[PDB]
Design a protein around this ligand. Structure first.
Ligand SMILES: [Cl-]
Ligand SMILES: [Cl-]
Ligand SMILES: [Cl-]
Lengths: 247, 99, 247, 247
């Protein structure tokens, strides 16, 4: 046989490159996944991740209460945190024994898979009673925030898209929904009459994941890296795997 | 169970399918640790090898009003990826032939 | 001096082989131990080991209740497990909140040291109220199960004997005793009048050990291997140390 | 065929009678069980049963503390009952908050299977520090109480033997052991050199059972009757099954 890494007859080499290219390209096909992640960052350094993976389109919608830190199998001040909720919903509405709940998120990162069309991304960032813009009467139910998404890049390839916003003020009390549509450069509308019932089935077939990790380090090591997920850490470091035309 | 017109489905995480005994002890702290060790090998600090809350089997039943050729299933791993990595995952399999 | 590993003058070599041979042979003398182990396997993957080590003869006898999983310093559903016991002793005898107790053993392995005579082994596998065979009136108090014992072998040597039985059915609810006699190829009966009071003292001098290990891996690593004990794991892999005529 | 219940050709009839006779007689063979039960009766009407079933000989030995009522999975005044024990072991030895512990047995019934030889029965009824007769120096380690055993009879057959004694006084604070030997009308001593090691194995193969039943009615219904055990209730009513030459 020819010697490794010296000729066009390195079939092991060509198959390795095709294997990676086929993964990249399958994800961008209408057969492929589109994925969103919401990261809620808490003051104790823990991070709630909510992930949803679906065909055609994907989203996450969470109330103010659901985004608050919950420590499975530990004390959570559950009665005082009910009172905190009442005082967030209406000023002086509650009888809490604290000024600031450390369960309130300090920041949100939204990440989309590279199979999203960025121009389709929509976000409903509500107040604590789940109204998008002060009163329902004057609320557009979303904003198109795609222009704010940064490219997460590894070895020159886009491995994902990031929108990050801090909530560092006492008045940053939010409900949150985000939505994006899978890339579709074709003129076959996946929601046209032929395929619309498959999009309805995709809503039921979407898989959800949620978990609180103790630290960004544990999130990078045990959540992002093992699953070949894209990520952007507090130090602006990009994580993910470049696949297109790569060994 | 879910009952609807036109189409119907159920979607559950690994955690949501684990046994929960309403109004009894559930080892809730140890079962958090079990979840960490299922999501990533040696990721947790649980005091047991096997959680008895893990399902031993699944039966899926459809009403006779279903079209069997339309049935689709997404059987994911414990971090809710259909087929090892998202990049290579078809979001479902058509399992009607097995019903 | 002669060079190592080249002649009959390697006294370090000859003494190493004699040291191992003397251990093997001492164990098989009437001065030596005979040992039994009962392993109760639970559905959470934990394993209760009961061990007894004695001169001349050895056994273990446990009730249905004593073989159930007990987690030292954790919750055990102790009131519900009383009710489980009542419903096992008599059909519909209890008021338990579960169909199947996960504290019930899923399997039993009985292991004897290689110093046992296999033809002497006796087992009383009772029902949950400690009757060997349905009713006391028709019960032989034991079965001679030696023919079922497999040889645990390492490097061609018998390091122990294993009898394994699963309890995978809802109706596998047992009490258990097992007994074996130390090898005695001589015509000196260790229970003859000369030595019978020494056998009575052996019953009092027998040492017992019991512990629940979290996994078969922990049992192999921290119980079987450090003590040079024989074992057979779920994958039919043999553990123990060959000693006869070996360095 | 001949008509049922009209001739010596009712083989179904003859086999039914032999089946029952064979059970009766097997139990009385040297191959058969000998069984003892100790019933501890408490003031709340509950009953602790301890049972042991063995070849050749059988016994039960319990401390003062072990005979006290224990309610699995309920409160037991465990600290106060430690103090009760100290005040029972030595007058004014403890700091209990009660005059009389309701955990103290009010009575004991000892029952033997019909395979016992009554002349072999021995009892060590100790004081609360486990001395048979006031001081060890002057203690015979047992009394032969066989003469006190009543015959439990059903349909004219002995189905067991009962010794009952009340403990109704504040000073009735006991430790207890009882022992009996299987019938042996032959001149083959089961403890002679030929078989003595089998008697040693019988000590290890003996099966034990213990449980607290809520009432004598529950004991009769779910313990005595289902297992074809002999019993004598508070109203002097005999329970058990006659087998010898019976259909
Ligand atoms: Cl496509
Ligand atoms: Cl010897
Ligand atoms: Cl006989």
């Amino acid at each position: 046989a020819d010697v490794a890494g010296t000729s066009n007859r390195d079939f092991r080499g060509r198959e390795q490159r095709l294997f990676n290219s086929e993964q990249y390209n399958y994800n961008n096909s209408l057969n492929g996944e589109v994925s969103v992640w919401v990261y809620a960052y808490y003051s104790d350094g823990s991070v709630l991740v909510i992930n949803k993976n679906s065909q055609y389109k994907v989203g996450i919608s969470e109330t103010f209460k659901a985004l608050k830190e919950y420590r499975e199998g530990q004390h959570n001040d559950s009665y005082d945190e009910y009172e905190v909720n009442q005082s967030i919903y209406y000023p002086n509405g509650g009888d809490a024994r604290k000024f600031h709940s450390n369960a309130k998120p300090r920041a949100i990162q939204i990440i989309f898979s590279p199979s999203v069309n960025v121009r389709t991304i929509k976000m409903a960032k509500g107040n604590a009673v789940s109204v998008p813009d002060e009163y329902l009467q004057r609320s557009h139910p979303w904003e198109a925030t795609g222009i704010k998404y940064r490219k997460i890049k590894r070895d020159g390839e886009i491995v994902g898209y990031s929108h990050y916003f801090e909530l560092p003020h006492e008045y940053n009390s939010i409900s949150l929904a985000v939505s994006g549509v899978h890339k579709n450069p074709s003129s076959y509308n996946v929601g046209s009459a032929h395929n619309v019932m498959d999009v309805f089935q995709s809503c039921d077939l979407a898989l959800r994941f949620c978990n609180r990790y103790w630290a960004e380090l544990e999130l990078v090591n045990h959540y992002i890296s093992p699953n070949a997920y894209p990520y952007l850490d507090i130090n602006n470091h990009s994580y993910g795997v470049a696949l297109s035309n790569r060994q």
